[PDB]
Design a protein around this ligand. Sequence first.
Ligand SMILES: Nc1nc2c(ncn2[C@@H]2O[C@H](COP(=O)(O)OP(=O)(O)OP(=O)(O)O)[C@@H](O)[C@H]2O)c(=O)[nH]1
Ligand SMILES: Nc1nc2c(ncn2[C@@H]2O[C@H](COP(=O)(O)OP(=O)(O)OP(=O)(O)O)[C@@H](O)[C@H]2O)c(=O)[nH]1
Ligand SMILES: Nc1nc2c(ncn2[C@@H]2O[C@H](COP(=O)(O)OP(=O)(O)O)[C@@H](O)[C@H]2O)c(=O)[nH]1
Ligand SMILES: Nc1nc2c(ncn2[C@@H]2O[C@H](COP(=O)(O)OP(=O)(O)O)[C@@H](O)[C@H]2O)c(=O)[nH]1
Ligand SMILES: [Mg+2]
Ligand SMILES: [Mg+2]
Lengths: 430, 430, 45, 48, 427, 427
Amino acid sequence: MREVISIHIGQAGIQVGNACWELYCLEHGIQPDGQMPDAFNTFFSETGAGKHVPRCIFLDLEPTVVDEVRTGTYRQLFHPEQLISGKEDAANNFARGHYTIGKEIVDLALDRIRKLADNCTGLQGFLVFNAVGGGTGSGLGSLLLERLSVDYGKKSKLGFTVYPSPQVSTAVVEPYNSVLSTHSLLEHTDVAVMLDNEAIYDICRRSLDIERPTYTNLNRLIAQVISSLTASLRFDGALNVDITEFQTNLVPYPRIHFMLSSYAPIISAEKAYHEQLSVAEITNAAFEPASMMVKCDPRHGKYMACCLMYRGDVVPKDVNASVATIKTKRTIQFVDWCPTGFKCGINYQPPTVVPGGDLAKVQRAVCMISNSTAIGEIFSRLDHKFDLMYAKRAFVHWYVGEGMEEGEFSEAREDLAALEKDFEEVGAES
Amino acid sequence: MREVISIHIGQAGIQVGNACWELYCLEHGIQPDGQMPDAFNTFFSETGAGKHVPRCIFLDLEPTVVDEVRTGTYRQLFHPEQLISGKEDAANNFARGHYTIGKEIVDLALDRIRKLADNCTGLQGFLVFNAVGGGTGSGLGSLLLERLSVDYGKKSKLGFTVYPSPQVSTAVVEPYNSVLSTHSLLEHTDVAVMLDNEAIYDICRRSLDIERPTYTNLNRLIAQVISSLTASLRFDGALNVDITEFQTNLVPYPRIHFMLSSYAPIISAEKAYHEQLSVAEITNAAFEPASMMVKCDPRHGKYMACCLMYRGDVVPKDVNASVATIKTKRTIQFVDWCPTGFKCGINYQPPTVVPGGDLAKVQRAVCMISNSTAIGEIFSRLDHKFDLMYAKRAFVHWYVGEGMEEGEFSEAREDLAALEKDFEEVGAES
Amino acid sequence: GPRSWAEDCNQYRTTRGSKSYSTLEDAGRVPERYSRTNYVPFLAE
Amino acid sequence: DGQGGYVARPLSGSAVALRASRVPMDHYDYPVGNAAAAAEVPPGKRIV
Amino acid sequence: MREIVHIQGGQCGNQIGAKFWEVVSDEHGIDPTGTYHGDSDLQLERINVYFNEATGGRYVPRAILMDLEPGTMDSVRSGPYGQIFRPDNFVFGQTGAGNNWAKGHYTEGAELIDSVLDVVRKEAESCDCLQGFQVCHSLGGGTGSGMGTLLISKIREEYPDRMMLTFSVVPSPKVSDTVVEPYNATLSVHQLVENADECMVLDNEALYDICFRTLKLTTPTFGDLNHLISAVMSGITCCLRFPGQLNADLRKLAVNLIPFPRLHFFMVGFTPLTSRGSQQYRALTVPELTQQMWDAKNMMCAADPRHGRYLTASALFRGRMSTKEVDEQMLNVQNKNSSYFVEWIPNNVKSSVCDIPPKGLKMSATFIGNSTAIQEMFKRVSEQFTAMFRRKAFLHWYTGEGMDEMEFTEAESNMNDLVSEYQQYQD
Amino acid sequence: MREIVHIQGGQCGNQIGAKFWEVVSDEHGIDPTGTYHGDSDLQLERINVYFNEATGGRYVPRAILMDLEPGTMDSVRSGPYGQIFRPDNFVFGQTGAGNNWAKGHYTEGAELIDSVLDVVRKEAESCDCLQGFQVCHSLGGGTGSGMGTLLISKIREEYPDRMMLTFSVVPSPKVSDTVVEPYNATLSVHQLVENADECMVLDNEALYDICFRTLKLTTPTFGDLNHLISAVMSGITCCLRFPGQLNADLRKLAVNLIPFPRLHFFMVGFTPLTSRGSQQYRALTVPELTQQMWDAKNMMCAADPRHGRYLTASALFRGRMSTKEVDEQMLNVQNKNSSYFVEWIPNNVKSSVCDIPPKGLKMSATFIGNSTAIQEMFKRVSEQFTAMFRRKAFLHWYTGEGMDEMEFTEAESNMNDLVSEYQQYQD
Ligand SMILES: Nc1nc2c(ncn2[C@@H]2O[C@H](COP(=O)(O)OP(=O)(O)OP(=O)(O)O)[C@@H](O)[C@H]2O)c(=O)[nH]1
Ligand SMILES: Nc1nc2c(ncn2[C@@H]2O[C@H](COP(=O)(O)OP(=O)(O)OP(=O)(O)O)[C@@H](O)[C@H]2O)c(=O)[nH]1
Ligand SMILES: Nc1nc2c(ncn2[C@@H]2O[C@H](COP(=O)(O)OP(=O)(O)O)[C@@H](O)[C@H]2O)c(=O)[nH]1
Ligand SMILES: Nc1nc2c(ncn2[C@@H]2O[C@H](COP(=O)(O)OP(=O)(O)O)[C@@H](O)[C@H]2O)c(=O)[nH]1
Ligand SMILES: [Mg+2]
Ligand SMILES: [Mg+2]
């Protein structure tokens, strides 16, 4: 049976995962206690008599964000030993979460993954949720993803990384911590989906017309992206797109595998009555620059590959019609060597709205995940952001003292410099 | 299917379109909420389940006139994001509405036009409602107009513009704004219908026999003019005339596209019962100079071309006979090189009447829209009006600092003079 | 003719198909033959 | 099933009507009259 | 077996063809729903001339409706008898010609002339032996003028041995309904002179005069004028559809009415038209039908026939009539005013009879005339053309798409050429 | 006594076959349960060709489903007419190809291709005589393409004298449904030439056009395409299942449509496709079926048949119709447009009639056409492959599983070898 293990490392992993499984219980009708009052086998395992436990781990060194799940509304849902805690956090240090504090907790992490792998019949992929700015999301995320490649080779890892914004940061050592994570992100992960907080900010401000939402509202509509990505496994549809299709369709070269995200209908409750939401309308809304999950302008780059996961009442005729309209306009630019750049996936279940959520009931949705050459601007900006502080070697005595050598910064800069060179020469016309 | 898209720029644009959309809802049975209790397609978008939203945009830099629409009785009619507001008005500055503060809002303005055009299936024209004397109607009016020509080439644009009167004006730099708005309105608009304020004041004083009307009473009968010409797209008729038919039938030369517009029966309630309304009487009253909605003498110039938007129970022969009697009338005069001079368009629906409006119900009506050489005296006065104030550089520092240079007033001066030379050389007998 | 698919396929045999060949029962009469002899044929043991 | 029974959920909660196909394929009892022609006509303008 | 394909273009041609199929289908007795519900066997004898047999007893017209805007499609379809046409034959555009001959014939007609030639070929190849193509359009608009004559240009080389009949209305002298009537006319008549095999000129103001002076209607509506056109159009093909004592198909009319290949413009008029008051007073007799037919005001064309000489006239009589009274009254009207006929053609007038009149009528007659007097309209539209072509007004629309002023002189040459031998044969 | 073994592969082939068994089973009158409820005595004569008699009157198809994900099997199993198949014929894998041609053919293909050929061996030995094999798959995918054409090569090696009907959809011109369509289509055609006997080319855009302009379906669902495809697949083998007046089995179409062995790509279209409303308007004769079958827009292929000559065409007429009326009408398409045919093959069109029509049809036909105009489709595939292969884009998934870059070169060499042969014979 089709089935995917989800892994949440770092605080941003736990808080998004608290909203992801909230959406997943509402898809399948699972109450928060853990009882249903056969699509659940993708994410839940039927334990004994009527008990469903998630196929997930909440690994975090900081105890306050993991026991908030333990003392929340989902105490009975999760198996208690999946929730792996620690004494002290990684404290925004890549050197800590990789070398001095993460080694004694990653062996506990591999045991639960091994037990979940034996409990699952045929495994299909790994979901890794982390933010590279934090120490736990980058240091412990690198350590867990490195061992999964050794333990389970050639098996796809579908990760979702929250990157720092061009303008807004909640930490100072995020440029240091993002670069070292990316050196471990090229070699081991298969498909990594780019996420950025500020591009979720102006989606909430403009489309959802709410002036001051919080991180609960960001992670709520992130789960709408995550669920529609994996909706093809749970429910039947006309054109199924599984995880193994994602690596072949979207990754042309082994080191270019970073993809943006988009969700087409972002409509508030009162906006739904006035606005008409057709397939041709939402496909244009999906390709709009303001609707993306990463603050980058697609006009600067070219779309090397695209993937459209549709949901709900979507006839295959007009998604064929809407794709033909996208090819005609000059604003959306493809790379010259990829004439066939669209994969379409049509499911047959509309997105589930949560009670008290800001999303309205929409019959049809698109989850656009597309490889682009404009993503090099995101990497180059962080590359220039990190190069400003390494020139004077600020904030290095903390990383050097926690195990790792200063030579790891030069190799991580060289690895991202190869990524800068890669996006230029691949995206250039020939 | 046939379609039309209306834009409304400035205080005069919104208040006219407030009266226009009030007229359009009564004709098609649209409730103020937007739900009827086939012909609505030209002005309304059928959204979801029985809700119709207008194909309009209400953009203005000043928020207090747009906010009246938001808090008024049509809060549920228009889409909420469809209405566009701004921070600070241009405030009678063509430099402000075109360069400094109009640039940040025109990028959002083209976004909604693109969404309305994409929802459209066959686009026939654009309706532009603005006053060239105001800062927003001239500045933001020109910037929105010039970008539409590049984005949508060879597409008709019906720009209904309210011009300042020789005797009546309420903003001091209206002659400054009218000349600068004229410099862009020639090469961009396809058909421009001149409107003047106090000729409507004279119509309401004489024909309506009411002594104290306000701009609400003016915009109601102006809405009847717009609804008369566009009624052949929505309703059938003996001689259906489209938006595309107006341009080649009323614009002989590429620069002469200014047209007068008159409504023939404009009769109060108790007057119409004693009045005998027939086609011969309204056709004579159509060409009657005091019924013209611009202060201009049709005897001074030559009627170059003319179209008649007959409505109601009009057979094709009493209009045939009335044209012959008008042709043999020695008071009017056509140009020598245009023997065939009449366009006849008959529709089968009598015009509606707004409850609480000054107009009474009539069986038949004529909208006389004509191209004349008499319109030169309107721009000859404005050329005299502008040259005297520019002779000692009055109110120039308000334009120089906000982007514009001194030479734009010089360059726009011969553009009116080349227009004045074109009118006098096209009415010259050969 | 036929008004339904079942009736068309059922009457295919008796109208235009393998059972359409004319039967002697459908023939009004058997023609009387001008045979050479109604006596014994000459070479017929 | 547990005893080898070849079990299969029909999955027909009247969703198979939407799943199905609508091609005419029928030269008998075709719709004759007014509404059959009027159904395929797009709405267009209205007539007074 | 000889049969007619009808092609209707423009707002005028679609509307007058809807009234044409209103009248003919009443004559052959088929209902609005297409089924036959008449009484006589002679109605069904020649139905293939205009209709196709369909399964289940339906009768569809052999009509192909074309236009560049969907508005005129809705008016024909929503009216009575507007359902009988095939839904595949309802080809239409979206933008519309907009009274522009350049848009109708070059830009917007190009991506739709292929679609109409896909279905005109389909209707022609499906049937047995084409007599010719009958079209109805207007010379003042752009939908039936530019796109209409583009089809006439295209269908001519596809079938160069078949008839062609253009029932086209021309602009009126007293009034104008579009301001670019001389541009639409002179460019369209330039196309019809080499392509159309024969043309029947109609005009609006003479239809108005007939409904006022003869029919005494106070307010003749928009559909009344089409019925006078449709009565003549049903009268041209009277010998195709019914038996007769002296038959005359549409090539007998062509070889008789056309002395020279460029003189294929005709003027037409329906004879027995009386007001409702004058029904109980007028005596329907062949001498009465003769003095109404040759009246100058009874012509549905704008030209006054007393100005010019008739080169050849035709009279397609319908009804049980003594043929000598048909024959003698033609000779009688030829010699009482012999100056108004032409001198170098012996036996100017042509008489044909059919034994089935229209319903209610005991006798009816359709007049087709090849008069010199139609040079008055052609010199008038040439007078209006040269007025505005010197000043180059209303011309940037026509040359804005890529049709320059080179053929405007060629169109003005042809209108001056066409009026030249009309005046030459007057002498 | 002539049997065809059906093998469905991939998402497209399984979903096409489910609607295909929706048509064939309903034609022979068997219910959803499995027993017989038909009202025609001609149905049960030839059930051997597509079914097997089981205990208690049950009928099971000769269908071997094949896929690498159980998800598409569940939709077929749950759906109506899905219980009729044999459970041991449901061979399937677990990992799924993920639109990789290497996974379907080389690495993961070997783990299932041993468990497929034994199952299809069981069906082939059970029946009496193999007329051929019928396989349905897609070329744009990797699950039904790589495993599909591997199955052809094995089954052609072990049964070398049997026919091979391959019904394959090709990548669409206007849009793309998966990103690696040029890589999979170039590799599949490279292996389908030397193995498959006759190949049928389908395209979704032509299905989307036929569902819109003929049937007037505003929302063509994903099974409307399959029903039109299944209308052909039931009509290819009509002579094997019903008595006929001029029989044509799979090998008659193999010998009359393949001039040279490599040129075995065809295109199909079902003839009497009408809208529901306009069925009353159109009549039903053999010439009207022939006019619809030779239209370029009635093809279910992406190619335009006007751009190339027809090498060989075959028509499979169905119903009560005259053989002269069939034969003289296929002469008219040889004479009306003789420039669109191959000059050096006299009698390009073969016609066969089987006088039992499909379910609910007066008359119908299936039109197979071997045209050289289909070189445009392969050139479209070839030009897309050359854009990606020089840049080595999307190749590390293929070359990471044993199929290195050398085999792509002979894949494109045979891709250009096929288009060279079509273009040469067009001259
Ligand atoms: N969108 C979103 N981002 C979050 C959320 N919580 C944390 N983040 C991101 O996480 C980054 C901070 O690093 P974290 O991942 O929280 O830190 P950590 O990995 O837990 O490491 P420690 O804090 O030392 O335990 C910030 O840049 C935030 O953008 C959340 O709820 N939603
Ligand atoms: N017919 C008509 N004219 C109006 C109306 N409101 C304002 N006007 C005209 O507009 C002129 C004032 O200039 P506007 O164009 O309204 O200036 P504005 O639209 O407020 O633009 P800004 O001043 O830059 O905000 C007046 O002289 C009036 O003649 C109206 O409701 N109906
Ligand atoms: N007799 C008659 N003339 C008509 C009719 N409709 C329009 N016309 C004439 O046609 C001219 C306008 O043509 P138009 O509608 O623009 O033609 P189109 O552009 O081809 O559709 C006018 O001068 C009318 O007098 C009709 O129903 N009957
Ligand atoms: N006509 C038709 N085409 C289909 C169907 N299912 C898939 N396709 C087409 O098959 C092509 C790719 O097939 P794919 O889904 O990759 O098959 P897979 O390899 O088994 O996953 C697409 O272009 C689809 O248009 C179907 O049921 N009917
Ligand atoms: Mg933390
Ligand atoms: Mg203002």
